[PDB]
Every structure is written in structure tokens, then in C-alpha cells.
Amino acid sequence: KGFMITSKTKRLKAQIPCPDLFS
Amino acid sequence: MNINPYFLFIDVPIQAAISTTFPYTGVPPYSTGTGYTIDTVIRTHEYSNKGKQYISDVTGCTMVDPTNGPLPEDNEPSAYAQLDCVLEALDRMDEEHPGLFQAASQNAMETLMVTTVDKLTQGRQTFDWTVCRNQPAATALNTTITSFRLNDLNGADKGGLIPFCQDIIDSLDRPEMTFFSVKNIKKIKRIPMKVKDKITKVEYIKRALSLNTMTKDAERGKLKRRAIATAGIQIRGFVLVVENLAKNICENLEQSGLPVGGNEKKAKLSNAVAKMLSNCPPGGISMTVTGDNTKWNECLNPRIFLAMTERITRDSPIWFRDFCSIAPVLFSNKIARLGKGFMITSKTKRLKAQIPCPDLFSIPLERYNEETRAKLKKLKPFFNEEGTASLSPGMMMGMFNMLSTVLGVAALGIKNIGNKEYLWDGLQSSDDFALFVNAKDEETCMEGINDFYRTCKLLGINMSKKKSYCNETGMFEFTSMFYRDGFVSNFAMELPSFGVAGVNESADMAIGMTIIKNNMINNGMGPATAQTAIQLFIADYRYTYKCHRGDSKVEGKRMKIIKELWENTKGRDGLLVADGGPNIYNLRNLHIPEIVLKYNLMDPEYKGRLLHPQNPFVGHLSIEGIKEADKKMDYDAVSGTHSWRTKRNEEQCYAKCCNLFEACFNSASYRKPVGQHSMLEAMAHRLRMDARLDYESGRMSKDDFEKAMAHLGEIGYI
Amino acid sequence: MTLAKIELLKQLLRDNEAKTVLKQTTVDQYNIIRKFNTSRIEKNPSLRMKWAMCSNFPLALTKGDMANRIPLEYKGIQLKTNAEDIGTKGQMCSIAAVTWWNTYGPIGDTEGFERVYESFFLRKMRLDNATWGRITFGPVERVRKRVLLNPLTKEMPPDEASNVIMEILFPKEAGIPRESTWIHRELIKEKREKLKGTMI
Amino acid sequence: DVEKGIDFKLGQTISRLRDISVPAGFSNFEGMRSYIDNIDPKGAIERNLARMSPLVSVTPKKLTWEDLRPIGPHIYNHELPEVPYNAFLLMSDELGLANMTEGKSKKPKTLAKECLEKYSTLRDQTDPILIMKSEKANENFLWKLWRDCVNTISNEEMSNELQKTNYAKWATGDGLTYQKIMKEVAIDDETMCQEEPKIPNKCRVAAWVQTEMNLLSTLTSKRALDLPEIGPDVAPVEHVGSERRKYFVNEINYCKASTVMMKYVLFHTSLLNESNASMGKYKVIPITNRVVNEKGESFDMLYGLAVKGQSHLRGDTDVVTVVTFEFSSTDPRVDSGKWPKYTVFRIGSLFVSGREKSVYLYCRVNGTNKIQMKWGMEARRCLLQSMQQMEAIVEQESSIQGYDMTKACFKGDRVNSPKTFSIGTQEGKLVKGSFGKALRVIFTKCLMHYVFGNAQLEGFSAESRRLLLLIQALKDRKGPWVFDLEGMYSGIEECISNNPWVIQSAYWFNEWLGFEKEGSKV
Amino acid sequence: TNYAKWATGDGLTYQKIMKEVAIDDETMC
């Protein structure tokens, strides 16, 4: 599924898919 | 080289170029008002905190009484007005005028006995207690009338304002109070219904005495915001009567700038300055104080106004004296509503919530900002449990303009203190006063100015030592009108009036041209300026209604039809600017409606089509505004296709009853009907006569007649 | 229409509120009844008018047979709609139909304007035949005076003016002529004759 | 019944309220009524004054030139930051993508499409060169949003709405908003505090304001301000008016401030139209203008693009967000203090006549409301404010000598020299200026009074008018006296915080006051 | 139910966004 990145100040999350692991 | 616009004043006097100083072309300041309202309450109580503090046993709200209080020992604003000094000023005014008080009071009483309740429908938005909001005056009055019907209160049907005020005063004693409240029931949809609600006597008294608040956003030339207060319908009658009485008194007073407006005020200003210049002794100096009063309503106790009302009506019927003294009583025990409350937010969770005023003190004060912390720590003593502030002392802006002006004129007219070798007189109007002091030297001029300042401080009036100055007579400013060496420049501030009036094409055009011509007459707008104003207004008018010249290649829905009409009709000088016609208006003919102006130049087909006797775009009910353009400005227009109206943005009961009555008696829409009988029977008789006449003329069939008469008999009138 | 009037009256009376108000308020009190409108006046007429002119059908047309003269869409341009209305109970329309009416449609009568708008045409006549002269650029001394803005055919107080207007254009509802119609009998007959033959 | 009279008696609650609403020292309204009806004051005012403390008085002090001091000394201080450019659109930096057109008026979307079509290099530029990302905005968001703008403008479909509708939501920051909860949770929660008020920054005198004031007040070969015709002039008075009007427009039309004013008016008109027509969809709006050269060629100028957010607002004071991308020929690195609010690129270069000059795109997020949105289309009244005063000026001259001078004041004649005002300065030497230049200066002053207008400007002008009138009185030797000078000065100077026009007005006021002080010796 | 949403912390949940914005935002880690 890739990875998950998150901004705590904005309280936002998003999933980076495997094909986009270097973008 | 570095440009500098201020250098224009090196080669020109400031008054001549005063118009450019004012930034009356940008966006006026606009806005929660709860903070401002709380600050106003805080300041009002602070100025009078040394008065007598007691607790009202009719409502339970704290009251502060500054009248006859300690004499101020500092320049700070003081509401401690001495009653004896007020009565002395009133007595001096009475002596200086022949029975003016009696004449004014009698005329006020006479016009009051003739006034109807519906006069209360005029004005601006008013506080409605049935919903505890701000509603249009007409709707608020209608709702209060409806509510009164439930609690055995009547007099609105009786007509005149006397019964309405009488049963309003009665309502304050009913052990309960029933009315209809809006219930936004969930069904998901939120549907509003009427729910029969009841409140006790104390709650009703508080609601009647409450003063709703709003932010004065429309202001143009003030950085700091002020709060304007709207009162309920239960004070409108009394406030109206007292204001009319004060207007009657102040109109005769040559020292009063109100209610005269326009060139009349300039005439008064110039006449007064000329008078004072004439009256100066030989070699003496007549100094003019340009004054701009501040805290003009946060220092005026309503008790002083009660005393003024009683003294003004010294010789009048007891019933009228009692009636006209109710407004000062209601204002002396008023309560102030408090905006919508502060808003608290946490940024670590992106959360926010507005806190309603009743919950102001449900939160630890350590969470509000330090400024609001202090505000609430100071407002706690007068805070009502329901979420209102007890504000007895002082007045909110805009209520007693005439009465406050009369008090100011009373202060002005003393004209001397201790028989000192000077005199003073001036102009006063609703928080703006210009004073003139004549003496034999500057030192005595300022002795007189200081004496007048002290005397003002004895009535709650506190002239602003920061917004005022003094100079030699012949140069000053009054209510934003500048006088210098006989030249009174009407400060050009009517610029924000050249936009389309937004009522319809022909009416908007007539209003704009009349505005241009009136500005030319009054403000000295030069002919070139008027021509350019015509140009700009025509540009805006064409743009706003999507009707440019038919020849021009602009594209649009109506523009294609305008293009078609351009060549489908030969006479091209008769079309209207709303039909892409060429502009014809100039300075010489701003007073003529264009339809009559272009009547000769039109074509027979064009004038027949446009000026059709019947137009689906013209309706009878649309004629209401044909007289006055909302200030009620008179404009001259012509019936035609361009006289249309825009779409709209016990209600139906009254509305359709009145509409049907108008449709039956077409004369009603113009002049007040007369008759001592029920509307139903008048309509029934008129309709019976009309049906008979229609049949006898052959306009109605026999079956139609029989059906109509059957319906009328069912109505019970045949 | 009188049958429509009686049917509307019956339908209105079917509700008890209409029955109680009509039988309660005398004819004189009608004024008060009329003044109980919403008073939800537009806060900014300029913005409202600007927005409305861009809407599909801002014009509020009164229900009638006029609409049939014009299609609901002419030359691929929408003019009027058959959707019902609540504010005015009529139909909706657009300035396109107004411009078309100014272009084509029924041709009315031109007689009425010769006399009905007599004051305006007299203003134009006084302007056209006026003679201009020089311009004096020197300072002008002006006095503030109470002046009549517009000429009047026969100046009269407001009440007499209203009574005369009713006696002119409202033949019915003329009970007991006062001591004002005999004074203005010539004006009454002149205006009556002039305005006869109109449909405004 | 005529022997009875009206009956209006007070109930119980109202009577009690009247009883307790009597001034101090009374115990019943009957007592107050009797006291007022009977007691006679015969010098109560003097008795009260004879005891009131002598520490209360107007404090009358005569005002001399020395007392007047420069207003707002903090602008001089260099420790404070330079004032930034907070106006809605660029004024002296706008780059006009100009396309010659036969004269046909077309929809703004098609006009922008064609203007970009002419300049293929800038239309197809896709690799930006970030010159500066200001403080918070994201370069990726702004560049992608601008690319979507260009694609939408250049798309074949007439629709002018963003085709993404989701990237813009975060580019404009619409989603970065708090979520409102009910009062109960806020009461219970302890971390839900109240935001401290955000006061404006205390800045210093910039330099771009003066340069823009100079540049917007100069003639340009390009004219845009056009006005509708009026009817034939038959009276002599309207003939004189027409001559004056022509002499004025021949001067104002060619000043760049007129072009800026027309650009602002057109942009705000288009913004209002889009907002009313489109409520809850992101829109693309070219910043269009029309410019006629002396030869009569009606160029159409594209000055940039703007994304309009979601304007679904019932009220008027509600804010709607718009992001502006503006073509310009100015590299901000020359003066980075003027552009701390702008994230810019370098999207190429262009030749005007053979002299290559760069072309950058200034991107910035901003917000407006229906009130300012309307006033944008009412900004044309500046023109009127420019004419009225000058009209008065001319009329004054006409009062002196009989004939009409509008040709004499502007250009002069064989009997009277051309009228010259004092307009500027250099090296401490004040310089004169033609009548037309003075009219231009006044028009630009009015335009700036609009563009940089807010609460601070009103509070500054309406309160410095006091000092203006005091100086006017002093120049006429009226010997004006003042009560609390420091109060007026504090009132005025509590408005010079961050408005560029307010700071420059304070600076010019101080300089002119110094000039008046030095010239008062005579 | 409305109160329990914030009492239990269920309402304090981060918001999902499209991968394009997240990649284009440099503050998301």
C-alpha cells in the first residue's frame, strides 16, 4: 500500500502509493 | 524630483481644497459587536460610578444614579448633572422666549391626539421581544399587536396612539404574558411554526426595557467602531412624542441647527456669524470655538430628561404630563442586550466555538484574552443572569437627538456667568456645537470659554478638549461644513450618489439626473463637473442594464435585440439610453424626463410600442414608488415599458385583505378611505353594484350574475 | 373580473382570520391594515439591481394575456417562463422581452401624451423657446429664499388638491362636495375633458 | 362627554418605575413634580460654580508654529520593517500583454486566450525559475494552479471554470479552516481559549510608494479612459463646460493612473459578475483592460489571471478568496522589501522594440468582500474628485478677470502666464508644476486614497484635518488657541501602523510642515 | 451523541487528502 505521511499542525494525512515512493 | 500632493496647499487655502483631504472614495470600514457593547456599558457606568448605586425592586437590576451627584474634580467626563442648574437654564430659556414652552407642548399634545398607531411602522429596524431579535418596524409592531390580543389588551383597533400607549403601560402589570414564538421544529428539515409561549411579569419587564445592540459599520470617518442601539416598540410611541415636542421647541430657537437641513443650515450659520461680528464691541475680539463633543450620550442621564419634560410642560393637562414623562422613565431603567458573544478557539485541534452571552461567566475568565478578561471582571457587577447588562445611566446614540439639542441650546443661551465683561452664543446640533465668545481681549474670551465649559460640565455635557480648538471669528467648521471669510464650501461628500438608484431604468435615470442638478444647485459643482458626472453616470447606467449603443459591437443577450431595433427603426435619435439610443441629456435639460425630451424624435411605431396604454411590464401595485425614491426623494418619470419592478427576494391575512380592498376601491390606493362601517360590508355593497352594472352593460352573463349573487348571499349582505 | 373578485373574496373569507379582521376593522382603519408590510427593504439597491440584471428572468410580469403575443423563446433567446410565482403570483420575464416589445408588438395610442403629461411638455416648451445671452464670470451675490421649484397651474393646499384630484379622476366616491369644487370648477372641467379618452 | 376630557392614568409597575427613577434627594415623583413646579432657581448655576473645584478647565493654550511637530516619528526609525505592498493589484508594474484588435468587444476568456496565443513562449512555459517564495505559500501549489489557469484559458471550450476543482481547494487554502462545535464542549474543554487580537505591524517609510506616486502621475502614449457622449451643447454655459471638460480629459486620459483605475474598475466588475453568476465553483478571471493609442488602435491588454474561490455567501461582509497571478517586468531582487507577500517566478522574456526585458509572474493569495467588490466599480468617482476642485480653481481665476481662463491656466495666453503650482521637490528645492501636472497629482492622490483605503486611512485623514485647519488658521494669523494638542497628535498618530499610503501621507505632511515653518519667516 | 464524539476523541481524526496535494506539500512527513 506504500506509506502514510501526515502533517500534525494541519491535522492532515495522505497515503503515498508504492509507485510514488521516490517523488 | 519627488512629487508631493500636500504641496497643493502651499498655493491654495485648505478650505478651497478641503474636498481632496477626505478619503470618501475608498471602501468604508466594516466589521463581533459584543465586545464593543460591553465596552460601551463599561464606560457608561465608569463615568457615573460615583453616583448613588441601588437595586431596582421592580426588575432587580442594579442602577447607578449620577444626578445631583458629586461635582467632578477632574477633566474626565462627568454625568453628575445638578437638577437645580438644569431648571435654571430652562427658566432662562423660558424668560428669553414668549411662552414658547406652552405653545410647543400644546402643539405636541394636539398632534399627538391626531396621531395613529401606524406611525410607529416608520423608522428603522426595531427590537422585537417576542423573538428577542431585530425585525422591521412594521413586522415588530404587527407581532406585538397580535400578542397583545391574547392577554386582553386592546387599543390598536381603537386607532389613535393614546389607547396603544395606555394598553402598553397596562401590559407591564399583567401577571403573565402570552404570545407566539417561532419554533424551528425538526422533521431532516427545520420547519418554522408558531408556538403559544408565556413569560412572567419580571421577564416581560426586562424584555420591554431591553435595548438591542448592533455595530455601526456604515461609519466613514472614524477608525474606532461605535455601537448603535435599537429599542423596542413599547418605547417608540413615547420617544416619538417627546422627540416631536423637543423638535417643536428647538425649531424656534435660533441656536438650534436641527431639524433644518440643506441650504437652510448654511443660511443659519452665516447669519449667526454675521450677527456675532456685528455685536462685537469696539476693538474687542469675537473668538469662535470649533467644538466636537465626545461622549455626548454616555454622560446624559435620562433623569435630567425627565426633569426637562416636566418643566417644559409646566402648564398642561395632568394626563399629557404623565404621558410624555413615560419615555424618560423607561430610558432611566433600560437594559442593554449584548451582541452574540465572544468566540473561543483551540489551534492544536482546529476547533472553534462562539460562546453565547448568557454563558459569558460560565467559563473561567483566565481563558478570555486579557482585554476581555478585564472587561468582564469590570462588567460582572451589572451582568444580568439572562445575558444582559443593567445600563441605567447614560443614553445610547440616536434616541433623544432633539431633547439633547434643546439641553445644549439651554446651556448656550445662558450668555453670561457672574456679569463678567463678555458674552457667548452659538449653534448646537446633536453632538456638534460651534461657540462664539465676544469680549474686549483674548484673555477674557478664554475666561468666557472656560466658564461655558464649566457650565456644560454641570449638565453632563463634556466638550472634547482633544477634538476642539479655538480661533478668531470668520473661520471654523460646523457639522463638516467649513466657513472661511464668508466662503462656505459645501464639502463635496455627495460623490457616493451617482450610482444607479436600483429601482428601474427610467426611474434610476430620472433620480440620477435630478441628483446631478441638485448637486449643481447646492454644492457648487461646476458645469464641467456636471457634464463629466453625466458621462460617468450614463456609462454606469448602460453597463449595469446591459444596454449600450446599438451600433457598438458589444455582445450580449439584450444587445442583439438592441442591434436589431437599431436598424428596424428609422428614427435613431429617439431611442432611449436603455434601448441603445444616443445620449441627449446636457446641463440645460436635466429637469426634463427624457421620454418627453425625445418624444418628437421618436417614430410613430416606436412611441406606440413603448408608450402602450397597457404594458405587461407595468403593474398597478408597482406604482407605490412612483412618487418618492428611497430619504424620500421626489423624481419625475413617465409610464412605459421601462417602468417595471424587480423580483421579490397574520401576514397574508392583512396583505391580501388590503390588496383586495385596493382592487375593489381603486381610489383607496391614492387617498385614505373614509367610513364608519366594516370593510366587508363596504366591499359587498360595491361588488353588488359592480355586478349589476356589469350585467346591465352586457359585460357579464346571466349565469355569471346568478353565481355572483349566490356568493354574495352566502357572504350575508344581499 | 367582478366574478373573479367575488370568488377571491369568498376564498379569503373561508379562513376565519379574514372573517374576523374584515368584520372588525372599519373602513377608516384600513390604512393601518395596509401599513403592516414586511419592510424587508433591500439593504443595497445597487448590488441587488446588478445581480438581478444578470439573472435569467428578473422581471416580474403580471399574469395576463399579453405574454401570448411573445413566445417563451424568440430567435433562440429565452424571454419568459411559465413557472409559478409566490411573491407576485404572476410570471417571470427578462429585459429581452422588453426590448422586443420596444421593437415589435402591439402599437398603442399616441393621443394621451399630448395632454396627460402637460407639465413635462410645457417644461420642454419653455426650454426650447428660451433665449440665451452672455455669461458674467464676476462674483454673484445670492440670497437664500423660499422659492417654488416648479410652476403650478393653480396653487392650492394639499387637502384641496387631493379632493380636486378625486373629483376629477374618481367619479365614484364623491360624497357631499365641499366648498372647494365650486372654486375650482373650471380646473375640474378642463382636466376632466383633457384626460378623457385615456387608458393609463 | 365633552365635560370629561381625555383619560390616561399610569398603572402600578410604571408608577413604581417613575417613583424610583427620580433624581437623587427625592423619594417620589409627586415630590419631584412639586419641586419643579414650585421651587425657583435664582443663581443656582453660580452657586454650583462657586464651589466646583478650580482643577477643571479647558486649559486654553495659544498655539504657535513651534508647538506643531512632525506626526508619527516612528516611520523615520529604521529598526522597523519596510512597509509592504498590500494593494489588490500591481499598479506601476503591470505588464500589458497587448494585442491589436479591430475593435470588437469579446468575452474576457476569449481575449485572454488570444493574448496568450500571440505569446506562445509565455503561454507554453512550464519550467518555472523561483525568484522568491515569500514566507508561507507553496511554490508547487501556486505553479500548478497557474498552469491549470493557463490550460483552462487556452482550452477550446468557452467554459472559464477550473477543470481540477480539487487541487485549487488546497492551493487557495479553503480546506485549511477550523470546524465549529457546539458551546457545551467548548465550555467543558480547557484548551479552547480566545485568540489574542492581532494588531497591525508598526512599519517605516518605504520607497516604492514614492516611485509609484511619481510614475502613475506621468503622461503615457496609451489612453484607456473613455466616456459616453452627451447631447449637443446649445447654451453658452454648456459650451464653456464642454471646453473645460475637453481640456481636462486631454490631460487625465494619458496619465498611467487613469489606466490603473480603469483596470481596477474592470477587474472588480468582472469579479462581481462572476461571483453573482458562479457561486460554489472555482473560476478563472483575466485581469483585462482596453487601451486606445493616439492612432486609434484599440489594443486589448491582458495583465494576468486570477482564480476565484467559492463565493457562496448570503451576507456581504463575508470574505471570498482570490489568487492573483500578474505579469510584470520588474525583478523583485532589486528591492526585496517591497515584495514580502509575493511568490514569484521568471516565466520568460519579451521584446517591446528590440530591447529584451524579462517577464515574471507575481503570485499572491488575497481576499475580498461584496462591499469592496462593489466599491471597485465605484472607484471612477476619483475622476470627479479630480475635476471639482480644479473647476473651482479655474472659476476663482475667472472671478478675478472677466473672460474665461481655462486655456490660460492650462497653456497660457499672450496676457496671462500659464498657471503653475508647487508639486514636488529635489535636494531640498521645491519645484513648480503645470496645471495639468497638478491635476494629475490630485487624481493620483484620490486613486491612492481609494486603493490603500481602510480604517487606518479614515482615522488618519479625519483626525489630521484638525491640524490641517489649525495650520490654515495660523497662516491667516487668526492666532488659534488649542486645549489639548498632545491629545490630537496621539489621535492622529495611532493610525500610522502599516498602511503604505498612511505612512507616505505622514511623511509628506511632515515635509510640507517643515516647508511652511521655513517659509513663515516673511 | 454529539457530545460523546468529542468526549471520546473520535472527532479528533486527521483528514485524508489526494496524493497529488500531499506530494505537492512539503510540510507533510
Author numbering:
A (entry chain Y): 353 to 375
B (entry chain B): 1 to 31, 34 to 189, 201 to 643, 652 to 670, 684 to 752
C (entry chain C): 1 to 200
D (entry chain A): 195 to 716
E (entry chain X): 359 to 387
Pull text from the paper.
In the nucleus of the infected cell, influenza polymerase (FluPol) uses the viral genomic RNA (vRNA) as template to perform synthesis of either capped and polyadenylated viral mRNA (transcription), or unmodified anti-genomic copies (complementary or cRNA), which then serve as the template for vRNA synthesis (replication). ANP32 is required for both vRNA to cRNA and cRNA to vRNA replication. ANP32 comprises a folded, N-terminal leucine-rich repeat (LRR) domain followed by a Glu-, Asp-rich intrinsically disordered region known as the low complexity acidic region (LCAR). First, it stabilises the formation of the replication complex, an asymmetric FluPol dimer comprising a replicase, which is part of a parental RNP and synthesises the genome copy and an encapsidase, a newly synthesised apo-FluPol, which binds the 5’ end of the nascent RNA replicate to nucleate formation of a progeny RNP.
A minority of particles are apo-FluPolB trimers, whose overall structure was determined at 3.57 Å resolution. These particles comprise the FluB replication complex, which is similar to that of FluA, with an additional third polymerase forming a FluPolB symmetrical dimer interface with the replicase. Further refinement focussed on the replicase or hANP32A-encapsidase moieties improved the map quality and estimated resolution to 3.3 Å, enabling relatively complete models to be built. The overall architecture of the FluB replication complex is similar to that of FluA, with most domains in the equivalent location, albeit with a few significant differences. In the FluPolB replicase there is a rotation of ~15° of the PA-ENDO(R) towards the PB2-627(R) domain when compared to the FluA replication complex, allowing the FluPolB PA-ENDO(R) 63–73 insertion to contact the PB2-627(R) domain in the region of W575, a contact not observed in FluPolA replicase. Interestingly, there is unambiguous density for the FluPolB encapsidase PB1-C/PB2-N helical bundle swung away from its normal position. This structural element, together with residues 194-198 at the tip of the PB1(E) β-ribbon, makes a significant new interface with the top of the PB2-CBD(R) (residues 466-474), which considerably reinforces the replicase-encapsidase interface. No equivalent interaction is observed in the FluA replication complex. This extra contact largely accounts for the fact that the total buried surface between the replicase and encapsidase in the FluB replication complex is ~ 5100 Å2, considerably more than the ~3300 Å2 for FluA. Human ANP32A binds in the same position and orientation to the FluPolB encapsidase as in its FluPolA counterpart, but due to sequence divergence the interactions are not necessarily conserved.
